[PDB]
Amino acid sequence: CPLMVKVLDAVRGSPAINVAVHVFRKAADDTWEPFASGKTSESGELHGLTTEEEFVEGIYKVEIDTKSYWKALGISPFHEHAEVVFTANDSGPRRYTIAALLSPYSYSTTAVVTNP
Amino acid sequence: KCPLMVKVLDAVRGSPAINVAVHVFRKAADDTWEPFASGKTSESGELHGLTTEEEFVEGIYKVEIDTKSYWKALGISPFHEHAEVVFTANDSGPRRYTIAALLSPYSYSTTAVVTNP
C-alpha cells in the first residue's frame, strides 16, 4: 500500500470518519485526471487507494472533502476542501501517508514518507 | 488593501516567509479557475493589495502559495508543490479575510481569520 490517508478531527478529538477523499494525477495536458477515491474508515484512515504498479512518479493531488464533513456536524466551515499536491519520487521511501488534522477554519497536513 | 490578505511564516527558521509567490483564482461560470490576482510576500511575510472590496465579489476562490520554490531557494527539497486554500467568499455579504500559512518542508498549516467590517 504505497499511499494512505489519515484524517483527524481537532474539534472532537477523534478520527474524521466517513470523509470523502479523491486522488487525482496530473495529465500531460495539465488537467487533473481521477486516480482513486474512497471514504475514511472508523479509524479515520483510507487504505487500498492504489498499487505499487500504478503509483508511478508524477504529480498527484489528494482532495479531502472537509466542507461536507463539517456540514454533517452542524459546524460552519471555511474551506471547500483540503488539497494536498505533491510529486511522487522513486528515489525516496516507498510508503506515503498523507495525514490531515481538521478544524472548521484551519487544517494542517503532513507527509510521512517511510520504508518498511 | 484589506479585503484579502495573505501571511506566510517559516516554521524552520522562525521567521516570515519572504518573497513567496501567491496566485489567487476565482471559479468562473464554466467551472474553470480564472486568474484573479497575484503577488509576492513582503519582508514581513505579508501580501496586501491583492484586490478591492468592489472587485472581490461573491465566489469560490483559490489561494495558491508557491511553497515548493520557496524551499528550493533555501536548499530544501520539500514534499508539497504548493499550499492551496479554497473557500467561498462574501456569501453573506462582504468580509475581510486573512489567509495565514505556516510552512515546513513536509507539512503546512493554514487558518483563516474572517472579520465583518
Ligand SMILES: COc1ccccc1CO/N=C/c1ccc(C(=O)O)cc1
Ligand atoms: C498534531 O498532529 C497532527 C497534525 C497534523 C496532521 C496530523 C497530525 C497527527 O497525526 N496523527 C497520527 C495518528 C495516527 C494514529 C492514531 C491513533 O492510533 O489513534 C492517532 C494519530
Ligand SMILES: COc1ccccc1CO/N=C\c1ccc(C(=O)O)cc1
Ligand atoms: C501556530 O500559528 C499559526 C498556525 C498556522 C498559520 C499561521 C500561524 C501563526 O500566525 N498567526 C499569527 C501571527 C501573526 C504575526 C506574526 C509575526 O509576524 O510576528 C506571527 C504569527
